[PDB]
Amino acid sequence: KKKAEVTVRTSQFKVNKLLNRKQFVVEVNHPGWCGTVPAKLIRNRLASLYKVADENQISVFGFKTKFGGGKTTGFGLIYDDLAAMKRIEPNYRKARLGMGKKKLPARKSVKERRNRNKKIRG
Amino acid sequence: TKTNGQHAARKLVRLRRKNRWADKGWKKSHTFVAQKANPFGGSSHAKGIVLEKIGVGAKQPNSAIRKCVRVQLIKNDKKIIAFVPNDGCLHFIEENDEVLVSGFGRSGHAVGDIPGVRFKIVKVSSVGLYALYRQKKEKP
Amino acid sequence: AKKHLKRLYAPKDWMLSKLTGVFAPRPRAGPHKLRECLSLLIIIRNRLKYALNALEAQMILRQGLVCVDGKPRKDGKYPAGFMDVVEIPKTGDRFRILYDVKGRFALVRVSEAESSIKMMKVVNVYTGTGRIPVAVTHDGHRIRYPDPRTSRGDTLVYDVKEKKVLDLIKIGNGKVVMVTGGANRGRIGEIVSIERHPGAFDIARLKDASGHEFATRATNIFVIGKDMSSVPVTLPKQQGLRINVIQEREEKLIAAETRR
Amino acid sequence: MRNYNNFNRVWKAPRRPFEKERLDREMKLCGQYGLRCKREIWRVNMTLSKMRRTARLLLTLPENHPRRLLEGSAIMRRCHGYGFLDEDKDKLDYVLSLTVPDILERRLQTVVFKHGLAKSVHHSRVLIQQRHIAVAKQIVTIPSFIVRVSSEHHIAFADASPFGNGRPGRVKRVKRNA
RNA sequence: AGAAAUAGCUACCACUUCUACGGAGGGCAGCAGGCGCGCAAAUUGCCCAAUGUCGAAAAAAUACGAUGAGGCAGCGAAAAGAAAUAGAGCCGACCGUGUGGUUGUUUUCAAUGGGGGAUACUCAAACCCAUUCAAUAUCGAGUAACAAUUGGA
RNA sequence: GAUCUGGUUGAUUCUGCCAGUAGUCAUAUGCUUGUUUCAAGGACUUAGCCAUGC
Numbered sequence: 033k034k035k036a037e038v039t040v041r042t043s044q045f046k047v048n049k050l051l052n053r054k055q056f057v058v059e060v061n062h063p064g065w066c067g068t069v070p071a072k073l074i075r076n077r078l079a080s081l082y083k084v085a086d087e088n089q090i091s092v093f094g095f096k097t098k099f100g101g102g103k104t105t106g107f108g109l110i111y112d113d114l115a116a117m118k119r120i121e122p123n124y125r126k127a128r129l130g131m132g133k134k135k136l137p138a139r140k141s142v143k144e145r146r147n148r149n150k151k152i153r154g
Numbered sequence: 155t156k157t158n159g160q161h162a163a164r165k166l167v168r169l170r171r172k173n174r175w176a177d178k179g180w181k182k183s184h185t186f187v188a189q190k191a192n193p194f195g196g197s198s199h200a201k202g203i204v205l206e207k208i209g210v211g212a213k214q215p216n217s218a219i220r221k222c223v224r225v226q227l228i229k230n231d232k233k234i235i236a237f238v239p240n241d242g243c244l245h246f247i248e249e250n251d252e253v254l255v256s257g258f259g260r261s262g263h264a265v266g267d268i269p270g271v272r273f274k275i276v277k278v279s280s281v282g283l284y285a286l287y288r289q290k291k292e293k294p
Numbered sequence: 295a296k297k298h299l300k301r302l303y304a305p306k307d308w309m310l311s312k313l314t315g316v317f318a319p320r321p322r323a324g325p326h327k328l329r330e331c332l333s334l335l336i337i338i339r340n341r342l343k344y345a346l347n348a349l350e351a352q353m354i355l356r357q358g359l360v361c362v363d364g365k366p367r368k369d370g371k372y373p374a375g376f377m378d379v380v381e382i383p384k385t386g387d388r389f390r391i392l393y394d395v396k397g398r399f400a401l402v403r404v405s406e407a408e409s410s411i412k413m414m415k416v417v418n419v420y421t422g423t424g425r426i427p428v429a430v431t432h433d434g435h436r437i438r439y440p441d442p443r444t445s446r447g448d449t450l451v452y453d454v455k456e457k458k459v460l461d462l463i464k465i466g467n468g469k470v471v472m473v474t475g476g477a478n479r480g481r482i483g484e485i486v487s488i489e490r491h492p493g494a495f496d497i498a499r500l501k502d503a504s505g506h507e508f509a510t511r512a513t514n515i516f517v518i519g520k521d522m523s524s525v526p527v528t529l530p531k532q533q534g535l536r537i538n539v540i541q542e543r544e545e546k547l548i549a550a551e552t553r554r
Numbered sequence: 555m556r557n558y559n560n561f562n563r564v565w566k567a568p569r570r571p572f573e574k575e576r577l578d579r580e581m582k583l584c585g586q587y588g589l590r591c592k593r594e595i596w597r598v599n600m601t602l603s604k605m606r607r608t609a610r611l612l613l614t615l616p617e618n619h620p621r622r623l624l625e626g627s628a629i630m631r632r633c634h635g636y637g638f639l640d641e642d643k644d645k646l647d648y649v650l651s652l653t654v655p656d657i658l659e660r661r662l663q664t665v666v667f668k669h670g671l672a673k674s675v676h677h678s679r680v681l682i683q684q685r686h687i688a689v690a691k692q693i694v695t696i697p698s699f700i701v702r703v704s705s706e707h708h709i710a711f712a713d714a715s716p717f718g719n720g721r722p723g724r725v726k727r728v729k730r731n732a
Numbered sequence: 733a734g735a736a737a738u739a740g741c742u743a744c745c746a747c748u749u750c751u752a753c754g755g756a757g758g759g760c761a762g763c764a765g766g767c768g769c770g771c772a773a774a775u776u777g778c779c780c781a782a783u784g785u786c787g788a789a790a791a792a793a794u795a796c797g798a799u800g801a802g803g804c805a806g807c808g809a810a811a812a813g814a815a816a817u818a819g820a821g822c823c824g825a826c827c828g829u830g831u832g833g834u835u836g837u838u839u840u841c842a843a844u845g846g847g848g849g850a851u852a853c854u855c856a857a858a859c860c861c862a863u864u865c866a867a868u869a870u871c872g873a874g875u876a877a878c879a880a881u882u883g884g885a
Numbered sequence: 886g887a888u889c890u891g892g893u894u895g896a897u898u899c900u901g902c903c904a905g906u907a908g909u910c911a912u913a914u915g916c917u918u919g920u921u922u923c924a925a926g927g928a929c930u931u932a933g934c935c936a937u938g939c
């Protein structure tokens with residue numbers, strides 16, 4: 033029958049010049065939507081709402097689906113430019129996009145060598 | 155009537171302390187002699203080893219043989235007599251096995267027409283005597 | 295020599311949830327007491343939601359963006375107390391720490407001229423080596439040459455950007471005070487009288503603006519001015535007037551109904 | 555282990571387990587409201603006992619008492635709004651006269667049947683558990699929901715339900731795929 | 733600065749490990765795990781994302797502080813809160829009572845979750861919830877074998 | 886919820902204790918267990934003995 037659309041609204045708003053960002057709460061209305069709605073679709077729509085050059089300046093996380101309904105609420109961050117986004121965003125959030133630091137060795141091995149090198153000098 | 159003082163709380167406190175030793179229920183919970191004489195050191199159940207199977211007669215108006223066993227406890231090596239319930243159920247006991255023993259009710263008082271027996275057999279070889287009776291399990 | 299502070303043992307006015315974490319930031323020693331203050335990490339992360347996590351407050355405080363007495367502070371666990379000006383020059387907002395009518399911390403936006411003024415309460419007057427009269431203050435400041443009329447209970451109006459004393463407000467019946475401890479914290483009223491009780495705690499009897507009467511220990515009043523109008527600083531919304539609990543409940547109920 | 559969550563109990567078994575008079579009165583309530591177990595009745599017993607106990611304490615207090623005025627208004631506000639007491643009764647003495655079916659009348663399983671959306675009192679429970687009823691355009695699937703006075707006219711079918719304007723249900727879909 | 737500190741030192745007493753027999757060590761009532769004891773009690777897991785402490789430290793790069801404190805998941809009817817195991821009728825056979833509930837025999841007719849799968853959400857990474865069986869476009873009870881027990885008369 | 890019942894006599898009215906009855910974030914054992922939320926978990930006896938890693 034009918035098509036499935038998505039509408040995005042922002043209830044609370046705040047401008048953060050200390051961390052070069054603006055914060056808000058995202059509301060998504062998706063009546064008739066099948067399944068959930070991936071976060072990249074929100075990023076497209078939020079970019080339309082506040083026209084940004086690069087959609088990667090937008091961050092969305094912590095989204096909860098309302099019981100027995102077609103609503104979903106999450107948090108949202110907007111950065112002035114990509115340079116500020118890289119500096120301030122936590123690593124695991126950048127890795128979600130696919131552009132964070134590679135990896136680190138298992139923590140067990142690191143603390144194993146730390147005690148081993150306590151028996152030796154130089 | 156009795157003392158009605160408004161400054162006589164000392165006399166009323168002493169009276170209640172002295173007279174509270176006169177009821178057997180309150181005395182049993184504050185005297186430590188019951189725990190020592192009790193084969194279970196104040197515990198719900200205890201584990202023991204079967205020594206032999208005995209048959210004790212019932213009291214006078216009744217007439218039967220009550221099919222008990224003689225059990226030596228493990229935690230303190232005391233000897234007690236315990237009753238094995240339900241029909242049959244003696245063939246599931248055997249000799250030198252290890253059993254779990256519980257009270258009979260009434261907290262140390264003998265029960266029914268069995269003379270001087272206040273313990274019952276619950277588990278044999280750690281399976282469950284009633285489960286064996288209902289065939290829900292097999293003897294290891 | 296403790297270094298932690300369990301959540302449940304923290305002051306209630308920080309309003310930290312008991313379901314979020316086990317610990318709280320212990321305020322380092324300094325101008326104000328541990329019980330009678332709130333730290334800079336609390337203000338940045340809990341009062342104004344500039345920072346979400348506690349790592350972000352470091353990203354603000356370690357740069358010296360926040361100032362607390364005209365000097366930027368980099369320590370999150372800095373103790374900030376009553377009558378303190380907090381200004382963030384990048385954002386342009388300045389708050390003064392005061393007590394609201396219910397005895398809780400209140401941050402009220404002040405003007406540019408006001409942000410350079412601070413009120414202090416004398417607690418001790420002594421002599422230094424040589425003959426230097428120096429007076430200690432409720433926030434720990436020491437003033438080298440005060441007015442020779444200063445005494446224990448009075449208050450001083452202080453310029454923070456440049457260190458000097460503006461004027462001294464003594465104690466007496468006419469003046470108006472604000473209660474700073476004892477479940478009457480956050481009430482403004484005049485001094486009806488003060489009772490001596492030598493060797494023990496003096497009792498000061500005060501009259502509210504609405505004609506009510508209340509009393510408290512004399513070590514809990516902070517004289518603001520000689521009149522309500524002549525206040526060097528700004529004041530919170532209610533002006534320290536408390537009203538009946540049933541009236542509070544009823545006004546809240548009807549106000550919600552007209553709102554929707 | 556270092557947790558600070560809370561929990562409590564909502565019901566209580568009655569003394570004297572077998573009284574023929576109480577057994578029949580409770581059975582009558584169950585088979586006529588279509589309840590599942592006696593615990594549902596015994597929940598109503600304790601919530602009733604709490605309002606009665608606080609009303610009794612307040613009524614003992616003298617009039618114009620500050621505690622009496624504030625709490626007295628609060629309990630009447632809850633009782634009127636929830637639909638336990640009609641708006642004419644306002645003296646705080648009509649609280650004690652509350653009985654069990656008065657609270658059981660406000661249950662969402664009951665109110666659905668009264669409005670006529672169901673053919674019985676057990677049909678309505680099945681409908682509620684299967685995500686068909688919406689109170690204020692929000693789907694509610696818990697029979698013990700106690701309907702407020704300002705929400706009876708908003709009760710209707712849910713959009714997502716096949717009986718509303720939703721897609722065909724399980725039987726229709728599997729018949730089409732057959 | 734602060735200890736008469738146990739993942740600081742010294743000795744004696746009880747048990748105890750390696751050795752080339754000259755000697756040298758050990759302290760789980762910290763975390764997980766084993767033996768014994770008993771009626772009686774969980775994995776030799778992942779992580780610094782949150783909460784904090786310490787520090788010569790904000791974050792970012794030609795450049796990632798530690799942390800079994802802490803948190804997360806595995807086992808878990810201690811206990812506590814919600815809650816399925818069916819709803820409407822059809823046609824005979826009826827049961828009582830005076831024509832209105834009812835008790836099986838045939839038989840349609842919708843609805844829904846145990847079950848399984850993602851455009852995917854969560855998550856520090858995985859899991860559980862919460863959404864959804866087309867949005868051109870997505871699986872499924874009928875002797876509902878998807879079968880309620882434990883105690884009694 | 887400010888509640889009681891069975892046993893002394895050929896019957897009756899008592900004192901009085903045995904037995905019944907409801908709970909317990911109170912422990913253990915037995916039988917039986919589809920879903921979900923929140924959760925305590927080697928105190929009890931032996932402040933007994935401890936391989937290995939942190």
Ligand SMILES: [K+]
Nearest residue numbers: 735736737738
């Ligand atoms: K020591």
Ligand SMILES: [K+]
Nearest residue numbers: 760762763764
């Ligand atoms: K251990």
Ligand SMILES: [K+]
Nearest residue numbers: 817878880919
């Ligand atoms: K079943």
Ligand SMILES: [K+]
Nearest residue numbers: 241883884885
């Ligand atoms: K029988």
Ligand SMILES: [Mg+2]
Nearest residue numbers: 739759760762
């Ligand atoms: Mg150790």
Ligand SMILES: [Mg+2]
Nearest residue numbers: 772773810913
């Ligand atoms: Mg256990």
Ligand SMILES: [Mg+2]
Nearest residue numbers: 893894900901
């Ligand atoms: Mg006699």
Ligand SMILES: [Mg+2]
Nearest residue numbers: 927928930931
């Ligand atoms: Mg122990």
Ligand code: NA
Nearest residue numbers: 628629631632
């Ligand atoms: Na209320």
Ligand code: NA
Nearest residue numbers: 738743758759
């Ligand atoms: Na030692």
Ligand code: NA
Nearest residue numbers: 780782799802
């Ligand atoms: Na950390």
Ligand code: NA
Nearest residue numbers: 555556802803
């Ligand atoms: Na934890």
